[PDB]
Design a protein around this ligand. Structure first.
Ligand code: UWM
Length: 282
């Protein structure tokens, strides 16, 4: 809709990179507004998918989903550039290690991620990359899902998408890892991992790749994924974060049920987290 003229785009700084793209901060100044611009870094499989990605964000209208500004005829790398709002405090992965946030605020953030996710699922889309690095902080009381690079439509007569080296396998349910099927419930498993990350304040030594690789080992050839799948199937899970309530840990564990149908939906999670937030808010 809003065609941002490439001439008025002044690069301020790099914001971050993810799978097949890079996001950068720009001032859109036709004389002398801060916007976030995503550009393709990349194979021809992901280049045809890029247009599909832009159309996904273009049709999402939600308070806990990053605001799509427009596009620009990007000659700079031939494929189109995606213009979004600049979400001023950044990703939770970058923010939480330096800012000690209370349990109450963390649970609000979790509730808001569920609202954005329940909305995404009602639009017949799966995210496939739900992690703290993809959750942006607008202010201390507002969070938004900020990136949709792996987001796909679930085909109409199926309950899953049939799904690479860039897969976030440490955020993935066993069905994605073993059967390469991504269900709406596979996104709930990743949410449980995002909630663990939030509760550990995104501390590196406590991260899911760190924790799972201490359980797998690093000398496993091409078998890290297989070893991950079998430990998950044996019932092993990420530990309870220090100072994470026992009830919140069980909620997380319910998000990590091996059987996808035993997991809560995002719609089921919203009233539960609302109540848990209200309890720790006082
Ligand atoms: C003070 N401060 C603000 C920021 C800030 C603001 N905004 N606004 C829109 C986007 C961003 C990002 C940002 C970083 N990484 N990403 C990605 C993952 C996601 N969401 C998107 C990219 C790909 N591909 C990685 C976005 N970072 C950082 N520090």
């Amino acid at each position: 809709p809003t065609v941002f003229h490439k001439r008025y785009l002044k690069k301020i700084r790099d914001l971050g990179e993810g799978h097949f793209g890079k996001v950068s901060l720009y001032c859109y100044d036709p004389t002398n507004e801060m916007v976030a611009v995503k550009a393709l870094k990349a194979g021809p499989q992901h280049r045809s998918g890029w247009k599909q990605e832009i159309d996904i964000l273009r049709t999402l209208y939600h308070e806990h989903i990053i605001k799509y500004k427009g596009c620009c005829e990007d000659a700079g790398a031939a494929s189109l550039q995606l213009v979004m709002e600049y979400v001023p405090l950044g990703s939770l992965r970058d923010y939480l290690p330096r800012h000690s946030i209370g349990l109450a605020q963390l649970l609000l953030f979790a509730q808001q991620i569920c609202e954005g996710m329940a909305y995404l699922h009602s639009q017949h889309y799966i995210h496939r990359d739900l992690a703290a690095r993809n959750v942006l902080l607008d202010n201390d009381r507002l969070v938004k899902i900020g990136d949709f690079g792996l987001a796909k439509a679930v085909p109409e007569g199926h309950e899953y998408y049939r799904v690479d080296g860039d897969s976030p396998v440490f955020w993935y349910a066993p069905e994605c890892l073993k059967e390469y099927k991504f269900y709406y419930a596979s996104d709930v498993w990743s949410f449980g991992v995002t909630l663990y990350e939030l509760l550990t304040h995104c501390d590196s030594s406590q991260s899911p790749p760190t924790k799972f690789l201490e359980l797998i080992g690093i000398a496993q050839g091409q078998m890290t994924v297989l070893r991950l799948t079998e430990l998950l199937e044996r019932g092993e899970r990420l530990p309870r974060p220090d100072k994470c309530p026992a009830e919140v840990y069980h909620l997380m564990k319910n998000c990590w049920e091996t059987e996808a149908s035993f997991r809560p939906t995002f719609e089921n999670l919203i009233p539960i987290l609302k109540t848990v937030h209200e309890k720790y808010q006082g």
